[PDB]
Amino acid sequence: ALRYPMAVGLNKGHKVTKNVSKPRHSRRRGRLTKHTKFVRDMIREVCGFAPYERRAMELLKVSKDKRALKFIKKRVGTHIRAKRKREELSNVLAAMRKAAAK
Amino acid sequence: PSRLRKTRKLRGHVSHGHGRIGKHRKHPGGRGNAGGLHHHRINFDKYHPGYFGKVGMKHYHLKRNQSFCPTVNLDKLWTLVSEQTRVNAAKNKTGAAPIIDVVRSGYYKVLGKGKLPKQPVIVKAKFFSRRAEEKIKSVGGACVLVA
Amino acid sequence: APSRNGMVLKPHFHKDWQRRVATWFNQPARKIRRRKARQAKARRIAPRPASGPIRPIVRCPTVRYHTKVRAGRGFSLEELRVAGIHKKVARTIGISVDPRRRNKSTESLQANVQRLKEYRSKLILFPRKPSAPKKGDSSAEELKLATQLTGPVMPVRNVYKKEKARVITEEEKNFKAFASLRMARANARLFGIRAKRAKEAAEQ
RNA sequence: CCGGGGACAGUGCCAGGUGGGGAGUUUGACUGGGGCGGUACACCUGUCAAACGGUAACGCAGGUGUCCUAAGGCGAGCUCAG
RNA sequence: UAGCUGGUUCCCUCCGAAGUUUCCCUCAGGAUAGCUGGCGCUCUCGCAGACCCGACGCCCGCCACGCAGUUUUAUCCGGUAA
RNA sequence: CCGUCUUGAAACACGGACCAAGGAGUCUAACACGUGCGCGAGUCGGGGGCUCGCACGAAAGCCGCCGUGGCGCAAUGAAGGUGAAGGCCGGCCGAGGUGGGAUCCCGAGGCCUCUCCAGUCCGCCGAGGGCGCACCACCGGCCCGUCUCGCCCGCCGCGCCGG
RNA sequence: CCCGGAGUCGGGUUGCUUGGGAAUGCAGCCCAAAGCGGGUGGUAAACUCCAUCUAAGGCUAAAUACCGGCACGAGACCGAUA
RNA sequence: CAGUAACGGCGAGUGAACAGGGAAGAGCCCAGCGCCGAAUCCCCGCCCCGGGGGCGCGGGACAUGUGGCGUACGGAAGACCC
Ligand SMILES: [Mg+2]
Ligand SMILES: [Mg+2]
Ligand SMILES: [Mg+2]
Ligand SMILES: [Mg+2]
Ligand SMILES: [Mg+2]
Ligand SMILES: [Mg+2]
Ligand SMILES: [Mg+2]
Ligand SMILES: [Mg+2]
Ligand SMILES: [Mg+2]
Ligand SMILES: [Mg+2]
Ligand SMILES: [Mg+2]
Ligand SMILES: [Mg+2]
Ligand SMILES: [Mg+2]
Ligand SMILES: [Mg+2]
Ligand SMILES: [Mg+2]
Ligand SMILES: [Mg+2]
Ligand SMILES: [Mg+2]
Ligand SMILES: [Mg+2]
Ligand SMILES: [Mg+2]
Ligand SMILES: [Mg+2]
Ligand SMILES: [Mg+2]
Ligand SMILES: [Mg+2]
Ligand SMILES: [Mg+2]
Ligand SMILES: [Mg+2]
Ligand SMILES: [Mg+2]
Ligand SMILES: [Mg+2]
Ligand SMILES: [Mg+2]
Ligand SMILES: [Mg+2]
Ligand SMILES: [Mg+2]
Ligand SMILES: [Mg+2]
């Protein structure tokens, strides 16, 4: 006939019927819980910020965010750890600007 | 057996088969493959051309399972089945062709060396040559792909 | 020195090898010692089947070996759930759970549920107190058949189903088999770059 | 404890310098002995060379590591030293 | 470790060398081709007609190929001796 | 006056007073070719397992496509990858042709018997002729890499697509 | 309703190590985390789908090794310079 | 698998893994998060068996966290069914 199941190409393989399952419970390691979110920001308001974070937030006040991305990347090491560190710190400045406008 | 070797015939002759002039020494000329560019150059160029240098692209972690493709030629294709399969297909009034799955016989590609006997056959393989799948259609058969 | 013609050999003997030589002269001694521990274990577990638990049907994992099928480490928890037996009673019955094996397909799920149910109807379960059978088996069943099974428990079949001859229809006769491989090998090769040229031409 | 220094010295890690104090190794070949001198160590012409070719020695006489948008390519017309 | 010294154990039979080419940090060594032996193989002549016996087809004439450190007959080649 | 190295040893070259005993091309691995054997498009259990109770026996036998695997049956390209049938007239045949070619086949003609006449049945020689093995040289053909020229074809995807 | 191991991961750099090749492992030193996160997906990088596992806590028999020890058995081994 | 991918004055040399087949086969435990009137452990003295058991207005450890339940294969608590 037409469209024999073929061993090369885009749609390849032996054409099997997949079952859906409840996933393995180890797949939710490191998903944020409500209670551990509450612990982790009680600590931040009682400990503050590290001096590289406190310096990187100053480069983000003056809209100098390429240099703040390069600075964070120099200190934590990886591009993807830096650009989620930056948007974390930007949510600190966006929250602190809003909380001080009132 | 040590009773059939040259050492038992060379047991009165001083040099023991290695000459008075030259001698039998330890390693006259280096050890192993020493000197293949310098003093054993003529031996490597006369007999092993290509021995020195790099050609082609490196490929780390070659996993030879994912390039497995054993081939069967087209003339050893009816040997994959019994003989009453081939014989009863020739006697058949209705045009029924038997099936030859080469994958259960351990082959993935069919190659087209040879000649087929003149009767239709359905061949199920994973791969075909161009002119292997037109020596099946000319005998009157069909090619079927299996993944 | 190379003499005239021959291979360029590279023998691996530059590394003080005759200090580390494993001879094999205790080979028939250890075929006897192993065999006397099979015979001793098989009479410790006296009707239990001499070879350990039942093992699943497992498809071999590469493109070289995926037509054959073997026995695995054990049954997955999803196979135990729908065969309806607990994961902690099953080793006490001789089933050998494997807790880290996924079930991606359905007919390999069903072939091991079918293996489990066919095993469970086949085994003979003695009671805890032989003076009082609770739920296990009838005492007539435990007498004339309580023998130990030798070899693997229901060993794994390579079943090749025989398809019969048929008539080649006209459209199956007219199937460009080489050409469909070369086009399918070309479409997957050019798939990403045609999609990029499609989305840039949406503007220009 | 009393004085005296004191965010320096110092220590740890990296970088640059110095470093026969110390380490390891090398310190061509041919050659009328070796060294010194030469290069007969890759090439080219004539001779040796014994009228096919081949033919040695630290044999003889010399050359070479370049030069050239023409000193390359065609065509035409010319004739040189004296 | 030694490309260097020294030694390397019974008998008969047959065959029997090389110190030269080319390359090498090569010149007391090796690779390389020559020279040697062994193992064969492919063919040829053929074996010769029991003792016998030159023969037995078509007046003549003829008796396989190939090969050579050789001459002959043709024919080219050379710049030594003189 | 022997061994020795050497162009060259009786040597004013070296070693050797004498006798007994010991005393030097081995074993493993990997290759190459040659030979013997078995099986043969396959071949091989080498690892494991099974078998009265282990004198010999730490042997021997057996397994089954336990053949997993090795090597062999397919090459070529760095790689994506691709991947070995013609000949004769749509039909027949199934690896082409020329030159040589052991052997085998045909064979006109001859070859005898007391004598011819006719015939018969086998033997021997045999000019020529045929089919030609292996191997050799040659010429074509096919597969893969790569060039140069060139025009067609295919479709679920009309493409910087496939052939 | 409840869900997880931090001077750790990771990054840089130096040194050893590895078949590990723009860095396989290990260590020093500096920097130093995150929580739909983190690790891995054998070519450095950005982007994005997908797969895979849950590091920085712990225990565990069997199959495996054995020129020493205790105690045995055997050998195509040696036979008193062995 | 394999003298293979790969390393290598890419020279000499070095050099694994996964799949497949066997031998053997076995799985588990905390911390944390939480609830249980610290429900826990050591020591001593007396009392019954040859450590058990039972006493002590007997000591001490321990809320800077012992025990039970419970660990990524999820778990718990409620109802409901069995
Ligand atoms: Mg010899
Ligand atoms: Mg000698
Ligand atoms: Mg010699
Ligand atoms: Mg010499
Ligand atoms: Mg087992
Ligand atoms: Mg010095
Ligand atoms: Mg010199
Ligand atoms: Mg001459
Ligand atoms: Mg002119
Ligand atoms: Mg020397
Ligand atoms: Mg000498
Ligand atoms: Mg001349
Ligand atoms: Mg003259
Ligand atoms: Mg002399
Ligand atoms: Mg002498
Ligand atoms: Mg003298
Ligand atoms: Mg001397
Ligand atoms: Mg003397
Ligand atoms: Mg003696
Ligand atoms: Mg052989
Ligand atoms: Mg190393
Ligand atoms: Mg990559
Ligand atoms: Mg442990
Ligand atoms: Mg003695
Ligand atoms: Mg004595
Ligand atoms: Mg002694
Ligand atoms: Mg004696
Ligand atoms: Mg191999
Ligand atoms: Mg090494
Ligand atoms: Mg707790």
From Swiss-Prot, chain A:
PROSITE patterns, alphabetized: RIBOSOMAL_L36E (PS01190)
BP GO terms, sorted: cytoplasmic translation; translation
Keyword Cytoplasm: yes
GO cellular component entries: cytoplasm; cytosol; cytosolic large ribosomal subunit; cytosolic ribosome; membrane; nucleolus; synapse
Assigned keywords, A-Z: Acetylation, Cytoplasm, Ribonucleoprotein, Ribosomal protein
Modified residues (N6-acetyllysine): K61
One Pfam family named in its UniProt record: Ribosomal_L36e
Subcellular location(s) of the protein: Cytoplasm, Cytosol; Cytoplasm
An MF annotation (GO) of this entry: RNA binding
Alphabetized PANTHER family for the sequence: 60S RIBOSOMAL PROTEIN L36 (PTHR10114)
Assembly and interaction partners: Component of the large ribosomal subunit.
Protein task: Component of the large ribosomal subunit. The ribosome is a large ribonucleoprotein complex responsible for the synthesis of proteins in the cell.
Family: Belongs to the eukaryotic ribosomal protein eL36 family.
Protein name as it appears in the record: Large ribosomal subunit protein eL36
Source organism (scientific name): Homo sapiens (Human)
From Swiss-Prot, chain B:
Gene Ontology CC entries for this record: cytoplasm; cytosol; cytosolic large ribosomal subunit; cytosolic ribosome; endoplasmic reticulum; membrane; nucleoplasm; synapse
Biological process according to GO: cytoplasmic translation; translation
Residues that bear N6-acetyllysine: K46, K54, K109
Coiled coil: none
Keyword flag Methyltransferase: no
GO-annotated molecular function: RNA binding; structural constituent of ribosome
Biased composition (Basic residues): 1-29
Residue segments, region Disordered: 1-37
InterPro entries: Rbsml_uL15_N (IPR027386), Ribosomal_uL15 (IPR030878), Ribosomal_uL15/eL18 (IPR021131), Ribosomal_uL15/eL18_sf (IPR036227), Ribosomal_uL15_CS (IPR001196)
UniProt similarity note: Belongs to the universal ribosomal protein uL15 family.
Function: Component of the large ribosomal subunit. The ribosome is a large ribonucleoprotein complex responsible for the synthesis of proteins in the cell.
Protein name: Large ribosomal subunit protein uL15
Lineage: Eukaryota, Metazoa, Chordata, Craniata, Vertebrata
Gene, per the UniProt record: RPL27A
Swiss-Prot record, chain C:
Record protein name field: Large ribosomal subunit protein eL13
Encoding gene, per UniProt annotation: RPL13
Pfam families: Ribosomal_L13e
PROSITE patterns cross-referenced by the UniProt entry: RIBOSOMAL_L13E (PS01104)
Assembly and interaction partners: Component of the 60S large ribosomal subunit (LSU).
Subcellular locations according to the entry: Cytoplasm
Family indicated by similarity: Belongs to the eukaryotic ribosomal protein eL13 family.
Protein source organism: Homo sapiens (Human)
Cross-link Glycyl lysine isopeptide (Lys-Gly) (interchain with G-Cter in SUMO1) mapped to chain: K173
